[PDB]
């Protein structure tokens, strides 16, 4: 769903 950030990206 656009506007839900279910997870963080790898950094």
């Amino acid at each position, epitope marked *: 769903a656009e*506007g839900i*950030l279910e*997870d*963080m990206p790898v950094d």
Partner: antibody
Framework: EVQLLESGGGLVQTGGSLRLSCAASGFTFSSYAMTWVRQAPGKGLEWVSA????????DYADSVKGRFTISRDNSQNTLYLQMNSLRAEDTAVYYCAKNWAPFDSWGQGTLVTVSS | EIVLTQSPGTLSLSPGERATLSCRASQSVSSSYLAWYQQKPGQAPRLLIY???SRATGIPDRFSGSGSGTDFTLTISRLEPEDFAVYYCQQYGSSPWTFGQGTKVEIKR
């Protein structure tokens, strides 16, 4: 049924330590970042900390950097918040929440009082 | 840091009236990544709107949200009794995540 359930709050001496846990069920825990938000009594909401799905990346509010460690056990469906060098400003209801942002599922909160 | 300024501090309205809640940001909020929560006394917060304008699941359609950049709005078209609570906005466009100070909506009688 999605459930988040914090544990571990209570009175702590100033400069002492406390660990919080949040048990999760009803969704596949290892697919989501998990989050700690806090609320001082009568005050607004503050973002505290966040951890990647795989325990892979952690982030913190500046006020807690170097004193708080977030962690998670994906074998146990548990989120942790280790709290050191606690001060009165840390007194709050601590909520567990699902996602990096925004937060669809919240726990019931656990009250952490930091006093002598 | 992105500072969120909610207004009014308190809103007092008879049920059935239109409630309009403002959230202003000190920086632009990327991707319109702005959420709205409801919080009743002694309860955890409840997600109402995400992405500035999308309703969460099981949220009645009288809650609607609009805006972009620095100016965001939560509209409750007909205030129902279960609507009287504190309303917080929250940005997730840039780290760290921040919330506004909240708006108290009480019912006038």
């Amino acid at each position: 049924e999605v459930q988040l359930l914090e544990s571990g709050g209570g009175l702590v001496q100033t400069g002492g330590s406390l660990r919080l846990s949040c048990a999760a069920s009803g969704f596949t825990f290892s697919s989501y970042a998990m989050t700690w938000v806090r609320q001082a009594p009568g005050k607004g909401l503050e973002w505290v900390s966040a951890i990647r799905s795989q325990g892979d990346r952690t982030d913190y509010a500046d006020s807690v950097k170097g004193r708080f460690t977030i962690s998670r056990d994906n074998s146990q469906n548990t989120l942790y918040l280790q709290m050191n060098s606690l001060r009165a400003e840390d007194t709050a209801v601590y909520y567990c929440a699902k996602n990096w942002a925004p937060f669809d599922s919240w726990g019931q909160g656990t009250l952490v009082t930091v006093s002598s | 840091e992105i500072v969120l300024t909610q207004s009014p501090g308190t809103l007092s309205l008879s049920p059935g009236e239109r409630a309009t809640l403002s959230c202003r940001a000190s920086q632009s909020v990327s991707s319109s990544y702005l959420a709205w929560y409801q919080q009743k006394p002694g309860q955890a917060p409840r997600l109402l709107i995400y992405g500035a304008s999308s309703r969460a699941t099981g949220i009645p359609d009288r809650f609607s949200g609009s805006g972009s950049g620095t100016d965001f709005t939560l509209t409750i078209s007909r205030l129902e009794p279960e609507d009287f609570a504190v309303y917080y906005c929250q940005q997730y466009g840039s780290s760290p995540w921040t919330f506004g100070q909240g708006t108290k909506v009480e019912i006038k009688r």
